[PDB]
Design a protein around this nucleic acid. Structure first.
Ligand code: MG
Ligand code: MG
Ligand code: MG
Ligand code: MG
Ligand code: MG
Ligand code: MG
Ligand code: MG
Ligand code: MG
Ligand code: ZN
Lengths: 214, 102, 83, 137, 135, 24
RNA sequence: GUGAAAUUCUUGGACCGGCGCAAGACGGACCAGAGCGAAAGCAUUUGCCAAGAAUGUUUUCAUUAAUCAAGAACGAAAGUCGGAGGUUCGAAGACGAUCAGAUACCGUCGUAGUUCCGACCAUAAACGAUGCCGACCGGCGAUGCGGCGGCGUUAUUCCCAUGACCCGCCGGGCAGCUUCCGGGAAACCAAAGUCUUUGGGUUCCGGGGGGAGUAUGGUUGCAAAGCUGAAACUUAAAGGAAUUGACGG
């Protein structure tokens, strides 16, 4: 008869120290009765939140997952769980009379996380170009993709998860791919389209606390 | 009486083209034959763009766009008035119709 | 043009025409004197070389065969041979 | 009490409104930021009894108004929006209830965050229903 | 609405303008009086309908040419339009913008090396074609 | 009659005739 | 879910939202009057295996070539047999709709199949409804590949190449626009032209409409059927392209 929303109590959500904004928002969950522990109820919750809401003056077409791993008091401590491009940005990316190049790699972080990296790029038409189509030959696409794989993995396997996140928040990788690929075929709208988690390193509580601390 | 030189499809050097499904009736239509209308719609209609912008917490937000590419069989295209019958001479003009933007 | 002088075409369109479609066939290729760096002798390299020609005395390679014409390495001076 | 948190007056609280506005139905479903906890879910089917106007703008706006008073009742001021059509191999544009539910929610005292399309887009789906000759009508 | 003149009244009005131009003037009533004897019109309604369109036409032709024709109107308007008579011709330019290729053509003609001419900087970029395809 | 269905009807008649000849 | 419905699933938590897992399909958008292949056909990344056109060639053989009865390889889909797998879709079938009836079109399930391996079959509006090789006969702008030239912009570096464009040329392609080349019954076709001014070489193949791709014989196939293939009889038209009208849910 009585509603259970009285039995639901609210918590707050806290971001890792990669970002200048710390509070994502608020959740709700039932109280802990019997075997139903509210702590494990909050764990495993992902929060698709805009990067612009995480930073101060960055772009709003990126989104982070930020799954929770530890809860203490009214704080749900989250860690980076994946990044993706917004649907309207991806749809605007695809144009006719050009070539799309996609690459997917598996990179193991020095910290221990396993990451599947998705990166997309598009060919570019020059300012003085008169030809309607800017197409790249198959070997050019293959060399662009091979360069994309190699200089994506060479900077991500060389540093821990913390350094990976703080370097993809402006997508400095996409700028490096874009700069390196110009000698083969110029590209303009190069971004790391997506990145997802595959393995997690045994859930060290101290690593989360230092990631939210000093 | 061959009505069209291209037989109503853009296939010149191919033998076979994989089909698609009409987004209105799910007719199996060859891809090079179907009518492709790639629409860029506003997420919110022009009557409610004000109400969403007023209620937006952000001081300056840009309403997104729906990017849907639509594939039509010629029967659904004609029934939905996407394409119309034309004269014998008018059928040979391949320029897209004007947008009438001003 | 009905009265084109087929017998005496000017050299520019003959050079423009395909080699077999010329009035009399003439190969586009030619032989050229190539001086490899750090030597004294002169070796002949086909302008449309298909093999890597090697300066005998000097170690560096001369031409890398490509699609149409030989790819002379930097510093290799070449002179034509009687046009 | 008040079924909400201890948020300050100036600070706003963000929910997530999944609008599965397909043809023949208009789901309005406000959850929390994680999505695992729902606040209220009202649909045009539960607001009308004619069974043909379940995606109609009138039923969708009634659902939007009803979910709005529940969100305000439980203490929700701002609301992200995730519009969704049928998806899959079927149609990709949202039905007629998406627009009326959007306007009605805004005009019923609610704030709007970021709007995103979450229609399921297959890379390449299974065979669509209808046969190779389609729905002959 | 509904005041469009038939081809009957229009052509009759044009014809009497062709033959009788000096006899007619800007006044409607005078034009309808001369219409009585320069032409026979069995209807009074047609008479002043024709005369009405005559005054409308002659008002227009008092300051321009129309699809009607007068042999005088041809000759004095060709005597007029003498010229703007500029003090000098527009083609006697002191310096002429000449491409270097054009000067090469002129010296092939042998009429090159004229102090009136001066060569200009050739354009560089060779991008003259419009971008093919829609936009 | 549609030629395809006339063909199909013809196949039925041929199969009936083969049945009768096998019977004899 | 539909035009409206209904069958069907649903307080046993359906649908919806979230985190995951499994399965078998399918490779969107990029994707084009673009590429390749003898056609059928071929679209996620990377590697291996052979193969191929075109371009380049002052390399080699020296007529080794073109088309082809007999014969042979491949050959969409559906179908057959055997073994796996069966997500979706879906012949048959059932039910619910609709209708005067509705063995249907619409909806819910759903068998065979759709998927893979092997073995058959050899058929499509297998279409460009258009044989192959060769020669000649207009113009123009593109596009794919290769090659050759040239103002310039860009990539990095210290110069060239070398890539991205830009302006051309050559050859081989997919095509396009235009033309009183010419043809044709015209529609139209730079081939369907170079045809009473009739002969470049060579295959297949038609002879008014039906009967009829039927009967019979032979041969192939597990079958379904495929290949080859008449006659009696019947008929004054059947057809093609354009024109005008009339009509159109
Ligand atoms: Mg075919
Ligand atoms: Mg119909
Ligand atoms: Mg039901
Ligand atoms: Mg098959
Ligand atoms: Mg089987
Ligand atoms: Mg089913
Ligand atoms: Mg022959
Ligand atoms: Mg006959
Ligand atoms: Zn359709």
């Amino acid at each position: 008869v009585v509603d259970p929303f009285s039995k639901k109590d609210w918590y707050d959500v806290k971001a890792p120290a990669m970002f200048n904004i710390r509070n994502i928002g608020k959740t709700l969950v039932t109280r802990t009765q019997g075997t139903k522990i509210a702590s494990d109820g909050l764990k495993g919750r992902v929060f698709e939140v805009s990067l612009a809401d995480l930073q101060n003056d960055e772009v709003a077409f990126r989104k982070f997952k930020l799954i929770t791993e530890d809860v203490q008091g009214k704080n749900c401590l989250t860690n980076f769980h994946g990044m993706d491009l917004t649907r309207d940005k991806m749809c605007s990316m695809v144009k006719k009379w050009q070539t799309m190049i996609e690459a997917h790699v598996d990179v193991k972080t020095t910290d221990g996380y396993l990451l599947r990296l998705f990166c997309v790029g598009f060919t570019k038409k020059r300012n003085n170009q008169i030809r309607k189509t800017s197409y790249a030959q198959h070997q050019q696409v293959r060399q662009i993709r091979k360069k994309m794989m190699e200089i994506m993995t060479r900077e991500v396997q060389t540093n821990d998860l913390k350094e990976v996140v703080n370097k993809l928040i402006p997508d400095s990788i996409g700028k490096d791919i874009e700069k390196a690929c110009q000698s083969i075929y110029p590209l303009h709208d190069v971004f790391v389209r997506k990145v997802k988690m595959l393995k997690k390193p045994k859930f060290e509580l101290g690593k989360l606390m230092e990631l939210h601390g000093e | 009486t061959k009505k069209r030189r291209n037989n109503g499809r853009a296939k010149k050097g191919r033998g076979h083209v994989q089909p698609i499904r009409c987004t209105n009736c799910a007719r199996c239509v060859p891809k090079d034959k179907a009518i492709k209308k790639f629409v860029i719609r506003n997420i919110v209609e022009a009557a409610a763009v004000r109400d969403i912008s007023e209620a937006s917490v952000f001081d300056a937000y840009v309403l997104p766009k729906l990017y849907v590419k639509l594939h039509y069989c010629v029967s659904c295209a004609i029934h939905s008035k996407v394409v119309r019958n034309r004269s014998r001479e008018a059928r040979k003009d391949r320029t897209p119709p004007p947008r009438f933007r001003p | 043009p009905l009265a084109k002088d087929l017998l005496h075409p000017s050299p520019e369109e003959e050079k423009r025409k395909h080699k077999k479609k010329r009035l009399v066939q003439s190969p586009n290729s030619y032989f050229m004197d190539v001086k490899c760096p750090g030597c004294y002798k002169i070796t002949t390299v086909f302008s449309h070389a298909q093999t890597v020609v090697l300066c005998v005395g000097c170690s560096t390679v001369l031409c890398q065969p490509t699609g149409g014409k030989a790819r002379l390495t930097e510093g290799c001076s070449f002179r034509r041979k009687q046009h | 009490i008040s079924l909400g948190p201890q948020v300050a007056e100036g600070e706003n609280v963000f929910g997530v409104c999944h609008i599965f506005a397909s043809f023949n139905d208009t789901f309005v479903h406000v959850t929390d930021l994680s999505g695992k906890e729902t606040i209220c879910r009202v649909t045009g089917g539960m607001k009308v009894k004619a069974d043909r106007d379940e995606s109609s703008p009138y039923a969708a706006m009634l659902a939007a108004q009803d979910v709005a008073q529940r969100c305000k009742e439980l203490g929700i001021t701002a609301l992200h929006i995730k519009l969704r059509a049928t998806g899959g191999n079927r149609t990709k544009t949202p039905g007629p209830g998406a627009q009326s539910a959007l306007r009605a929610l805004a005009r019923s005292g609610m704030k709007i965050g970021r709007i995103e399309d979450v229609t399921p887009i297959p890379s390449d789906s299974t065979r669509r229903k209808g046969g190779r000759r389609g729905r002959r009508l | 609405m509904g005041r469009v003149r038939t081809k009957t009244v229009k052509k009759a009005a044009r014809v009497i303008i062709e033959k009788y131009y000096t006899r007619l003037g800007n006044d409607f009533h005078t034009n309808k009086r001369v219409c009585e004897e320069i032409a026979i019109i069995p209807s009074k309604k047609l008479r002043n309908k024709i005369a009405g369109y005559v005054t409308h036409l002659m008002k227009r032709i008092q300051r321009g040419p129309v699809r009607g024709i007068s042999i005088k109107l041809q000759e004095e308007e060709r005597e007029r339009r003498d010229n703007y008579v500029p003090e000098v011709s527009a083609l006697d330019q002191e310096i002429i913008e000449v491409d270097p290729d054009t000067k090469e053509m002129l010296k092939l003609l042998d009429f090159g090396s004229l102090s009136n001419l001066q060569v200009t900087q050739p354009t560089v970029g060779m991008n003259f074609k419009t971008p093919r395809g829609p936009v | 009659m549609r030629a395809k269905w006339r063909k199909k009807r013809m196949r039925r008649l041929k199969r009936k005739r083969r049945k009768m000849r096998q019977r004899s």
